[PDB]
């Protein structure tokens, strides 16, 4: 019993775009851009749509980089998060009532103000590795258990 989500990292040679969510799940943390996939929509089309809605950017080709399943103890639905990256975008990042985007140099990624799982798989993303992960959370701050392995096919 899992629900489809997307997560998009705009990763350029020397910087990455992250967004500070202002409300809802994950508010107060920097993260990639994404959300729920809709009925009749491909996962990739959902990732492109969510990047636009949350950051104002238009992406062409998205590259599959990973899949991460999240379990929150006490919540029945698993989150099946399909992770994508791109280096080629159009537009300028847009701050909205819901999201504040900001560019980060790769040596200054704000892991202490990100979801704790990101410290595990961002190093793989940065070295262009693909991965499958599973994270079991207690609340939003504590990883009880996890698995993470590199793969050749997402």
From Swiss-Prot:
Mg(2+) 2 binds at residues 50, 53. Changing residue 53 to G: Loss of activity. 8-oxo-dGTP binds at residues 6, 21, 31, 33-36, 115-118. Its EC number is 3.6.1.56, 3.6.1.-. One of its GO terms (molecular function) is 8-oxo-7,8-dihydrodeoxyguanosine triphosphate pyrophosphatase activity. GO terms for biological process: DNA protection; DNA repair; purine nucleoside catabolic process; response to oxidative stress. Changing residue 35 to F: Loss of activity. Optimum pH is 7.8-8.2 with 8-oxo-dGTP as substrate, and 8.0-8.5 with 2-oxo-dATP as substrate. The keyword Mitochondrion applies. PANTHER family: 7,8-DIHYDRO-8-OXOGUANINE TRIPHOSPHATASE, OXIDIZED PURINE NUCLEOSIDE TRIPHOSPHATE HYDROLASE. This is Oxidized purine nucleoside triphosphate hydrolase. It comes from Homo sapiens (Human).
């Amino acid at each position: 019993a899992s629900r489809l989500y997307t997560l998009v990292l705009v990763l350029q040679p020397q910087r990455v775009l992250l967004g500070m969510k202002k409300r809802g799940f994950g508010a107060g943390r920097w993260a990639g851009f994404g959300g729920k996939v809709q009925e009749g929509e491909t996962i990739e089309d959902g990732a492109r749509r969510e990047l636009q809605e949350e950051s104002g950017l238009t992406v062409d080709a998205l590259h599959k980089v990973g899949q991460i399943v999240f379990e929150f103890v006490g919540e029945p639905e698993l989150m099946d998060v399909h992770v994508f990256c791109t280096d080629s975008i159009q537009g300028t990042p847009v701050e909205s009532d819901e999201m504040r985007p900001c560019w980060f140099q790769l040596d200054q990624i704000p892991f202490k103000d990100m979801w704790p799982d990101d410290s595990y798989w961002f190093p793989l993303l940065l070295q262009k590795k693909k991965f499958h992960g599973y994270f079991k959370f207690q609340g939003q701050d504590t990883i009880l258990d996890y698995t993470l392995r590199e793969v050749d096919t997402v």
